[model samples]
Target: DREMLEGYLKDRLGKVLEIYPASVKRKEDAIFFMVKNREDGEKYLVVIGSADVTEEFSGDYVGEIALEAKSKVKISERNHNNLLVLRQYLPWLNPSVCGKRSSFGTGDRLGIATPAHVKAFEGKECFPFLAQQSVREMSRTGRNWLSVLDDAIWGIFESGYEGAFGADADHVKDLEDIKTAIDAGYTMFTIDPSDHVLDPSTIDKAAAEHVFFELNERHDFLSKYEEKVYEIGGRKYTFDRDSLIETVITYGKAVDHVEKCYLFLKENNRNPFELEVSVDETSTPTTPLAHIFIVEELKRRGVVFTNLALRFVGEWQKAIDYIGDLKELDSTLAEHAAIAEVLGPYKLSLHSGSDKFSAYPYFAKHVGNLFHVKTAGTSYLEAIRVVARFSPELYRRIHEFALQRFEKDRASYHVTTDLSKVPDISKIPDSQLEDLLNEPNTRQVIHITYGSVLTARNSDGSYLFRDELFKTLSEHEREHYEQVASHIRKHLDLLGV
Candidate 1:
């Protein structure tokens, strides 16, 4: 069947394009295929059908075809309008809800990594969230949720992954941002209320007492937890007067904001979705006592969630291995996992989960299948790896630019990279350019400055590196997909998945 379709396509379009055989789909009386232009590597949707079936799509009639029956072939651009028509024929392109099973969110900064991400989780147990992006990522990359979702849809189609997957609106802060993601067809909303969570170690006793009094008047909060013994998996904890006051002061406003966001999501959401409450962005680690208080309070307020991200005891920095003691992490992680198991049975989410090879075994041993790990920007680094191999000059330019932008970009992140340690790119040979991704300092330098590198504008107002970067990755896509899949599979293997 594919041979027959390819014969007709080649006979009509000549040798200017390459067709993906896996992307062939047959509807009621038509055949749809995805083809790539060899010149600029742009993909187009080709449909062969009668004028009736072809009328629904907006494209130019390229040629006449006669396979089983005589019909006109239409070549359409892969835009949102054409994707809507394609969705009517292929229902699997839309994102659906992912339940409480262990899930993995692969955040694609460039939107072209979903097919590779799909390849990584092909036969794995975890549900793959192919379209995952945070509001911070959106602001940096100049993309909205609609583009992210559409990118995943096309990638899924290109890869021919028919199994169910999900889309996460990651690290969303406000209700307005949640509404935007909901409108864009995301199925998972990660509510981040870090701005409201006060670090107990930073404030004085008087400030803690003032916040406790203020929240006590509004929620009657401290009395609910006073003298109550929380019997978790194997431990018993009792809250004293000062302990209860500190707990109330630390997470009281954050919990209030979570409830408000949950209620808003329940009322305004159009599709079935899962919620994740996150406090992993704070300065201090989340203690076992704080975990008990937060989960119990959320349950008390009737908020339904599938995952919770607590601040673990370490620096979960971007694009690096685990930076804390494994022994202490194992003990504390076990306690937190136990609290989650007994309180609400939600998945313990790891926020900065990429490149944490040393800690995955501990997470797998304790949290087991009831865990969710989010990885953003690691795939972006792999994309840069592809650029280094194929287009060395472009990679060199990006490296030079990233060095200039690293200090400004690293301020907002929790990285400890020393720019002075990075080697001079000019001395490095072209064949060894890809080895820069292995060095921790160079990796962090390129990792933190992705926004500036991607969104940098030329004097003529056109993109400086975005177009060439995308073009190189598009032309050498097999290397990109293979490397990305291999790197992610290492994570899954270490996680015992």
Candidate 2:
């Protein structure tokens, strides 16, 4: 074991030298190293801890292996900033961004959940996607993509994790957004065209044709596949002339946008890039036909997807239980999973994928090993749940603060939490603080109000809860990890894998 360890260390150190010929560290540690970028041996640190030994990567940077190592190793402006570019400390590469189907998305709005998140997923079936964020979530939490990615990278280093995992540049809608995640060492790229996905019922045959022609003109020479037959799970599914028109109407624009993003990445791709298309943010549920259409179109366009999140029939809302008919939800999933089987070896990812305890049984029975689950800010809410126990006053203030901003923040989510449903803090006993988390209304309130809770400010233009929240949670970090692990383990185990 010692010889193997030494050999592995030497091999890694060689790569470090190749990237930063001047780079060196304790015991010749390659997983943790530093470099001189372009001139004067620079001040910034760039760590890229998001890949594997057999995997191809950029010598440029890894994870925040540099960032987390700074305090322990004493890296200074005089030395490094790994999270900006490197990913040494974190084992899981941002795989969703890189397009690996067998992964999970750990989104830390609090920027401290990765250690716990990764701990939850350590022995899981799929690779853990440690870095996950969206432009919307970033804006709401006052975080940028790099900062979110940095948090994940740092957590992995702190936990001393070493295995292939993943990270995500989630909900990327535009070219610039693509670059934001790509610039970081994120592997998974969730292309969320939620804003661009129009209501399928609205587009007529005429509009479909117009958009089809527009696609042809703008991105020329791709096969329309009008003549080909796509056999999904032994069922012969063909996109004939009429079906093509319907498919175009349902997902034409999103199809176009995803391809544009993929091709742009292809033109500029340096590292392996995972591509995902999310239609979960739309109003109407994604029909089975729509799923078939998007996958076939993507295959025809030669854009490989790592995973795709379709809007399930019932409400898979935030920080709450899966509402609506289980029969209908399971039936919907059966169709979606079957479609996935017939298509590429991609995952059917669950978005808004936190605390949906009821949905996992179907996933275990029907979806099997071919799916990915994504959760953001749920751990942050769980952290606040811990706060409610230890610091009721602090928790009460945040609860009140969240209540005030709920109406404003509610616009961006799909939750149906009636604030009235949450029990009055004064009435609920101190001993029962934990149980309140499972209360439907309470979960919805805190789950969706994360932005308000994390980013809201006071009258003096200072943060209302960010500092207190961070301090409170960090002090109780171990409990926070236990909560996160217990909760996430349920999400996976309930999925039957």
Candidate 3:
């Protein structure tokens, strides 16, 4: 076994990192490798199987070696921390995972979604995204990125699924948030500038430096590929001053803010990394012009996206089908895909990418497999559906509680769920309660109020629904997992791989 492991490292390490494996040592079932550079005498510890990387000697990864190999260096209190570089040869920390292969962004607010989520991706061609969260979501759920990563990590271990899995810092809007998650081993970054995003509020200040410089950057870059006259999907197109101004006004500041974050992370980050910028959670749909503008600016500033989510031409209400004109959607998406051909190999990330049954067929036809379809609340909704079947009184109370919190919770989300539309919860029979999840207003009411359900607390700071809900879901964990897998499998099924 030692010989086999050594041989595997000797071959795989050399191929992956282009380094020579000098020696190997075993600690219990765990192993450590001393790999050195040809030009430098420095060696590195290639730790495998959960090595304790917390010792004072645990330093940055480089041509620095092991505790076992620090024989001649005279390293101790003085030089040990400096010279003892710690590294995992095959790092489970997937820093560059997002853009590498098509990956799913699995957002588990309650931290129990991973086992089921893994099952959904069984035998799927794309990378199974086991770890993902938004800072707001974590904050709401009283969890952090570390917990998210830990949950997913254990879920992977429990499921015995040996596919490539990744963690995402979904909807990160600030440096502090990114810094926290990255430190906790989050590999994928979703830099959301939605707070910085504007909604046609200012046309006058498009010439400001943050606005103008970014726009000027886009103009100059798009100049190289400027179509003084061209045709897209059999229609002649042109980019003029007004059109350029329109694009800038729509996404200029967002581009500026996104670039600021990306540049900072790119400079500071040492691990393999993947990045995405989101403009989906806005008041308005992201025009093709805006999408082109954002991507152009990122490329102009030397950035590559794992995926960039557009608000798209339709409404992707939570737990609902796309409420937009198909023909109109077809026309715009056709052009968006074509523009992506020119400047984007990145998948078009579909945010609120749950229950869009009407959209999946078109996705199967046009978008097909190249998409990072993000679904967070959908899993929780299915869990709720399970609760609806399992406990009627608790489910009714949860629904009633959501009804009260709807107005406040609905404030942040893009929704038009009418409370009037959600039927009286107490009146509905227990058997019929599950049908409410399918109802438009009821779905929106429950979906948007997730934060409220999760964070609601008593005077003593004891949780109201969070603890009970977790216990309930855990009681029916298998059923919940199956429901999640079956629901998501249908999603992948219609999208046809």
Taking the tens digit of each residue's C-alpha lDDT, what string does model 2 give over 1-497? Answer: 33332333236444221132223222223334433223222323323232342122223322232323321222222112434324333323333343333566667777777768767876767667777777888887788877776666556655656666666787888898788677865787888765566665676757667776776676542365565666666566665666565556556677778889999889876987777788786678887766877887788889977788888888787787778899999888887888787676678888887877888788767777777888876777778779887777778887777777777778866567776677887777777776787787777777777876776778999887788766777667678889887777777677765
Task: Write down the lDDT of every candidate, Cα atoms only.
Answer: 0.87, 0.67, 0.68
Ranking by TM-score: 1, 2, 3
User: Which candidate leads in TM-score?
Assistant: 1
TM-score of each: 0.96, 0.78, 0.77
CA shift of 44, model 3, Å? 32
Candidate 2 Cα deviation (angstroms), residue 171: 0.4
* lDDT assessment of candidate 3: 0.68
Model 3 scores worst on lDDT over the 10 consecutive residues at 71-80
State the lDDT of candidate 1 residue by residue for 425-459, as single tens digits.
88999989999898889989999899999999999
Which should have the higher lDDT, number 2 or number 3? Answer: 3
Instruction: Evaluate model 1: give its TM-score.
Output: 0.96
